[PDB]
Amino acid sequence: GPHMATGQDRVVALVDMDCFFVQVEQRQNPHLRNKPCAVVQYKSWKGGGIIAVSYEARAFGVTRSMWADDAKKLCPDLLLAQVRESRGKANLTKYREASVEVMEIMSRFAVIERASIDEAYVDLTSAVQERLQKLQGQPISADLLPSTYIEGLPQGPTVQKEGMRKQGLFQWLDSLQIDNLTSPDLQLTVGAVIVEEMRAAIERETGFQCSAGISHNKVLAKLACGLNKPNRQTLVSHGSVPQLFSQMPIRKIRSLGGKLGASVIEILGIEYMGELTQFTESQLQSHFGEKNGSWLYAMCRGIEHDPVKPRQLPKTIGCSKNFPGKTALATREQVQWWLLQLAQELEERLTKDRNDNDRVATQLVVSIRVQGDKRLSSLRRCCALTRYDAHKMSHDAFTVIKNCNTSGIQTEWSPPLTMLFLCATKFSAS
DNA sequence: ATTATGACGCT
DNA sequence: AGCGTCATA
Ligand SMILES: [Mn+2]
Ligand SMILES: [Mn+2]
Ligand SMILES: [Mn+2]
Incomplete structure (x- = not known):
């Protein structure tokens, strides 16, 4: 209790x-x-x-x-x-730069965790407390939430989509107790008000539309975000979780879309996230390990503690190219030419990164795939990254991989390479 | 012959 | 350190 x-x-x-x-x-x-x-x-x-x-x-x-x-x-x-x-090779610079536009706007509102090129988590707990103090116990008007869905509403005793959205929002706002500054439902609502403002700022200042999820943790916020795309935001309350999860396929939850989620379904003989509640924590740990078991036990009840990490910038800067089917690299000079192409893009992005963000990469990771290997990567080797020079990086990359050549003929390369990957890692302030 | 990424966990 | 998993456009 x-x-x-x-x-x-x-x-x-x-x-x-x-x-x-x-x-x-x-x-x-x-x-x-x-x-x-x-x-x-x-x-x-x-x-x-x-x-x-x-x-x-x-x-x-x-x-x-x-x-x-x-x-x-x-x-x-x-x-x-x-x-x-x-x-x-394909060059994604335009999209990386557009991402920075958006991330910099979001950062004005709160600490963000860059989760991909096009999304970030926001921890709004502090901003909500501040806004609640400003509102002085005044009710939250529907006008402050013009693109917000309340998941699970309307419900109980109009055939248009926007009409339904407003009906649900009205029910939600009608119920709200705005007189305590500690009600989680109120806190989520104020969170949603701030996200409307954030999303308005993004569209005004970049031209780009987005969707958002607002909830009590990252997994529910991600799930919420997808429920009413495009150009809308969705609030998933703690109370909405039982009904939401009762018909939610396990694979829809972040980190369960792959082998683990498949094993949860097969081993336990269930389909929906809500069905997990009928297992003890120890039962789940017995099948899926200590960490995953505890995570599943809490998550199926809507609870997760993974923090929004203060990280606006990517931790790695990498360059890769596939050489599919017939184009697989079969000669040494081919391998060296492409290593150079990759290294030159890498040097360009690294030098820009150093100027913009006051940091330097210190490790170069070289990865390849060989023809026939089911795996995305066949081999990963690392070496020091001491200078931002494409010629040096490409020479060093070749050094750490050249023994993979099974060819008696050193001019030839066997087996042919179907992928090259160069990644700068281990940044240090500069 | 989706490709080109990026973060995190295990041993 | 190197591998594997899960996710993104
Ligand atoms: Mn995304
Ligand atoms: Mn997207
Ligand atoms: Mn997508």
Whole structure:
């Protein structure tokens, strides 16, 4: 009863850009706005690979990972923007720079954790306490939440989508006790008010729309964010969790979309997150290990303690290229040419990073894949990174991998290389 | 022949 | 240190 931790101590948001690389290209090229369109890398092989898709194009069934030639079969009028190519490879600089635009705006409101190129977690607990003090126990008006869904509402004793949103929001706000500054539901609501402001700032200052989730932890905030994309935000309260989880496939929860989630389903003979509540913590630990078991036990009750890490910048800067099928690198000079191309992009990004962020990478990680290997990476070796020079980095990379060559002929390379990856790691202040 | 990333956990 | 997992556009 009185000692059951409820995991309602924090207010956490997750902000995720809608169709992000597409919006970056649509801002640049107004002809692409409000159209079925997609972003593609390369073009020669089946029209290129799609990596982002506008919501107009999704309506035709176009998805990420689709070849553009195939997407065009579903959507003949699909418009395409190509990722820039530099030094023989796709170059993602435009999208990394657009990401920085958004992250810098979010950072004005609170400490953020950069979770991907297009999303960040926000810990809003302190900002909420401050805003609550400003509001002086005044009610929260629906006008302050013009794009917010309250998950699970409306409920109980209109056929339009926006009408339903407002009905649910009205029920929520009608119920709210605004007279205690410690009610978790109130805290989430004020959190949502701040996120409306954040999302308005992002759109005003960049042109980009986004969605967001507001809840008491990172996992629920991420889940919430996806519930009403695009261009909307969703509040998932502690109380909404039992109904939400009762039909929520386990794989939808962050970190359970892969092998672990599959094992939870198979070993326990269940389908939905809520079904986990019927196991003891020790039972879950017995199957999934101490850490995962404890995590699952709390998470299926809506509780998670993983903090929003204060980290706005990526921890690594990496460059990679696949050499699929016939193009696999079979000669030494081929290997060295591509190592140089990768190293040159890496030096460019590293030098920019050093100037912008007052830090230096100290370790170079070199990874390759060999033809036939099921795994994404066949081999990872590290060496010192002492100077930002592409020629040195590419020479050093070759040194740590050259013994992988099984060829008696040193001119030839065996087995052919299907992937090269260079990654600068272990930053230190400079 | 989705590709090009990035973070974290295990041993 | 090197490997594996899970996630992103
Ligand atoms: Mn997104
Ligand atoms: Mn995202
Ligand atoms: Mn996505």
